[PDB]
């Protein structure tokens, strides 16, 4: 949850 | 032909924030327009500030005024041959200007510097020169010094001629006066630096400098021009575009230090029929090749298409190839935008800029090349936000638009995190995204409210083999609700550091719980698991095994059993060792040596932990395990410390326990 990669 | 290639100057006025690009362009056209008499690309002529040179064709190119348009700015750097990089005497080396200079190094663009606004408060030329030296890493070479501080701004001291230049109205006519005594002592110091910087061009010049302790003005422009092209130095000049004092001398430095299309490396393209790289030298005899940089449109005239020619000649009536697509277009009427007139052309040679009036499918960044011999000439996001429509109903049509906008704009990215019910739209600037959302609000209809991405926290248990009783008894709406089960919960499987995702469910019931109610227990646990036991965040995974529980044949149903299982799973808030987790990233920082101290200690200002360190060309490569939460605004904070020199990569690495200052505030949130 936090960047372009979704991841987190 | 017409004008020889060596007499051409394809330049770009690179200026960003407090630079005054708009004034400097209007001025360039003004001075050139007048001097000669005696839009996307502006074809002008320059004979010299004092008519000292031959007539040159200076092709003023429009460079973007915002670093968020990375593709537009990277392309403009290929359309120009040399750069006129404008700074403000005050502001100086800003983060905005640092980025364009770094991509310029990537294409190896010979530059000169213009330190405009010497009239404005707090403006000092040499301070900016140290900033160019100390923060931009090239080798700036002042060819002028400044006369008067702020309001005191009269002119420049031409360090080659050694005569102070004052100005006469509208600042086109200049006075070749003398260096005032206060400046005489300083002009020496800076002249010696320039003569020396010129001396180290070729061995010839060093032996001539070593003979006397000097070189001729012509041998100075020789040395400075060689190293300008070699991309080893940036000749600096100052002025005030608005207050007219200095713009002709800048145009001269363009003539003196900037290259012609031949004095730069041949544009490297790809074989249309891409695993092979061919190239085109700025030659008329080389097969035709060019790129389209601005598709403008005039109401009366039609659709303009700004085209920089790299190799060969193109004439009105020609039939070419749009190598990108595959489609063959026929070249119609052609023009060349002048200062005010629209001058109608017939043919356009290598290293020149002409506009293709009315064309079929010709997109921006399109290669227009020789049909016979063809070639095709033509990034990580910085900022990411959480998006959602103003009214929950819209949701499907938001993703339709965003999905289309990401397909229209390759510099724009869209991704959804389902566990957190978040859509993450990303790109190059706050600006870039403010514009994209705005375009979705209008041209697409979906009004959306944007926020800072929320951290997708997860949950886990520690205590293994915990036997919890879930007892559901509700007497409502003319019925009874009975649910009774005991489930034994063990912690989610771990690697090393990686936690096993999902629910591992088993049936250990002797027959006290019926066959048909068992899946409803799984559903209850699963439902609770995603509803969260501690601070209301989904559990990573769980080992759950039901083994006991009574029932009342009439009041017992699947939903009562779903509830009692959730009732049991909730109790892991106390009986389970409820550990909140946080995303941990596998970060990699490529920093130059100086900045390594700042960067490395900033990773610790982020709870990050060092997992290795290599040694590279300019500096360090640091691999680190850093929480995503602490990663907020990295692309920027890092472009800040490294002075726009560093680069970073990241990817999700694992999940690990979160700190009590975070955790406790997340439970108080419940």
Q: Which residue segments constitute the domains of chain B, with CATH numbers given?
A: 1-265 (3.40.50.300), 266-378 (2.40.30.10), 379-457 (3.30.70.870), 458-581 (3.30.230.10), 582-670 (3.30.70.240)
Taking the C-alpha atoms of residue B540 and residue B365, their distance in angstroms, rounded to an integer, is 46
Helices in B472-582 by DSSP H: which ranges? 518-531, 558-570, 572-575
- Across the interface, of A4, A7, A8, the residue whose CB is closest to B426 is A4
Resolution of the experimentally solved model in angstroms? 2.9
- Spatial neighbors of B237 by CB under 8 A, at least 6 apart, are B112, B113, B114, B115, B142, B143, B144, B156, B246, B249, B250, B253
Tally the residues of chain B.
670
A5 chain-B contacts, CB cut-off 8 A:
415, 650-652
Burial grade of B7 (CB within 10 A; 0-12, 13-18, 19 or more): middle
CA distance B384 to B572: 35
**Do residue B632 and residue A2 have CB atoms under 8 angstroms apart?**
yes
Strands B289-294 and B279-280: unpaired
Residues of B in contact with A6 (CB under 8 A): 415-417, 424
Q: Is A2 in Cβ contact with B455 (below 8 Å)?
A: yes
Contact (CB<8Å) A4/B424: yes
Please state, in angstroms and as integers, the Cα–Cα distance from residue B33 to each residue in B370, B509, B539, following that order: 35, 94, 71
Closest CA to B138 of B229, B232, B246: B232
| φ and ψ at residue B624, rounded to 5 degrees | -145, 150
Q: Please, is B519 exposed, middle or buried when counting C-beta atoms within 10 Å of its C-beta (0-12, 13-18, 19+)?
A: middle
In three-state secondary structure terms, B274 is: coil
Distance CA B525, CA B564 (A): 9
Chain A residue numbers with beta carbons less than 8 Å from the beta carbon of B426 are 3-4
The β-bridge partners of B165 are: B156, B176
- In B, what residues contact A, Cβ < 8 A? 380-381, 384, 413, 415-417, 420, 422, 424, 426, 453-456, 583, 585, 628-629, 631-632, 650-652
Feature table: binding site of B: 15-22, 62-66, 116-119
B565 φ/ψ sector (left φ>0, alpha ψ -120 to 50, else beta): alpha
DSSP B568: H
What sign does the dihedral B251-B253-B258-B260 (CA atoms) show? positive
Cα(B21)–Cα(B18) distance, integer angstroms: 9
The answer to whether the Cβ–Cβ distance between A1 and B652 falls below 8 Å is: no
d(CA B170, CA B244): 7
Alpha carbon distance B656, B455 (integer Å): 13
Sheet with B289-294, side-by-side order of all strands: B344-345, B334-335, B353-356, B306-311, B289-294, B367-369
Beta bridge partner(s), residue B167: B174
Tokens 């690179």 belong to residue: B14
Q: Is beta strand B111-116 parallel, antiparallel or unpaired with respect to B56-61?
A: unpaired
- Structure tokens that stand for B106 in this block: 């990537």
Residue B376: half-sphere exposure toward Cβ, Cα within 13 Å:
15
């Amino acid at each position: 949850x936090c960047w372009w990669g979704x991841s987190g | 032909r017409t004008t020889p290639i060596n007499r051409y100057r394809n330049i770009g006025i690179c200026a960003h924030v407090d630079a005054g690009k708009t004034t400097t362009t209007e001025r360039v056209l003004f001075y050139t327009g007048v001097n000669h008499k005696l839009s996307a690309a502006v074809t002008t002529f320059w004979k010299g500030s004092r008519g000292q040179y031959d007539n040159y064709r200076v092709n003023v190119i429009d460079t973007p005024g915002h670093v968020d348009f990375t593709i537009e700015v990277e392309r403009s750097l290929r359309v120009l041959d040399g750069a006129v990089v404008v700074f403000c005497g005050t502001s100086g080396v800003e983060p905005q200007s640092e980025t364009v200079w770094r991509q310029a190094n990537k294409y190896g663009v010979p530059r000169i510097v213009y330190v405009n606004k010497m009239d404005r408060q707090g403006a000092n030329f040499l301070r900016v020169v140290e900033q160019i030296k100390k923060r931009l890493g090239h080798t700036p070479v002042p060819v002028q010094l400044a006369i008067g501080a702020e309001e005191n701004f009269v002119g420049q001291v031409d360090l080659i001629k050694m005569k102070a230049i004052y100005w006469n109205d509208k600042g086109m006519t200049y006075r070749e006066e003398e260096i005032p005594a206060e400046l005489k002592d300083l002009a020496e110091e800076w002249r010696s630096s320039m003569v020396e910087a010129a001396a180290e061009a070729n061995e010839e010049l060093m032996n001539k400098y070593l003979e006397e302790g000097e070189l001729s003005e012509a041998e100075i422009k020789e040395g400075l021009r060689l190293r300008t092209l070699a991309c080893e130095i940036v000749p600096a000049v100052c002025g005030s575009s608005f207050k007219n004092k200095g713009v002709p001398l800048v145009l001269d430095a363009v003539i003196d230090y900037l290259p012609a299309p031949t004095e730069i490396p041949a544009i490297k393209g790809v074989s249309p029929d891409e695993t092979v790289e061919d190239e085109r030298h700025a030659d008329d005899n080389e097969p035709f090749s060019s790129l389209a940089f601005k598709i403008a449109t005039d109401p009366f005239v039609g659709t303009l298409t700004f085209a920089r020619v790299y190799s060969g000649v193109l004439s009105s009536g020609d039939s070419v190839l749009n190598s990108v697509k595959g489609k063959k277009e026929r070249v119609g009427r052609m023009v060349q935008m002048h200062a005010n007139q629209r001058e109608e052309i017939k043919e356009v040679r290598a290293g020149d800029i002409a506009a293709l009036i009315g064309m079929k499918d010709v997109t921006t960044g399109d290669t227009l090349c020789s049909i016979e011999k063809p070639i095709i000439l033509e990034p990580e996001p910085v900022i990411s936000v959480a998006v959602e429509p103003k009214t929950k109903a819209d949701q499907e049509k938001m993703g339709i638009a965003l999905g289309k906008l990401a397909q229209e704009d390759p510099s724009f990215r869209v991704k959804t995190d389902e566990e957190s019910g978040q859509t993450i739209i990303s790109g190059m600037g706050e600006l870039h995204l403010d514009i994209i959302v705005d375009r979705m609000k209008r041209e697409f209809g979906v009004e959306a409210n944007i926020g800072k991405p929320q951290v997708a926290y997860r949950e886990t248990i520690t205590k293994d083999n915990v036997e919890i009783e879930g007892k559901f008894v509700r007497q409502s709406g003319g019925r009874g609700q009975f649910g009774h089960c005991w489930i034994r919960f063990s912690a989610a499987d771990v690697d090393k550091g990686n936690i096993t995702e999902g629910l591992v469910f088993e049936n250990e019931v002797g027959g006290v719980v019926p066959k048909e109610y068992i899946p409803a227990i799984q559903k209850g646990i699963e439902e609770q698991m995603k509803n969260g036991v501690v601070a209301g965040y989904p559990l990573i995974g769980l080992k759950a095994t039901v083994f006991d529980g009574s029932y009342h044949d009439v009041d017992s149903n699947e939903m009562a059993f779903k509830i009692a299982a959730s009732m049991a799973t909730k109790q892991l808030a106390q009986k389970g060792g409820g550990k909140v987790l946080e995303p941990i990233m596998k970060v990699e920082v490529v920093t130059p040596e100086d900045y390594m101290g700042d960067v490395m200690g900033d990773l610790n200002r982020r709870r990050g932990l060092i997992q290795g360190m290599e040694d590279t060309v300019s500096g360090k490569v640091i691999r680190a395990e850093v929480p995503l939460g602490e990663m907020f605004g990295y692309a920027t904070d890092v472009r800040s410390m490294s002075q726009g020199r560093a680069s970073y990569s990241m990817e999700f690495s694992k999940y690990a326990e979160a700190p009590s200052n975070i955790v406790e505030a997340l439970v108080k949130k419940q």
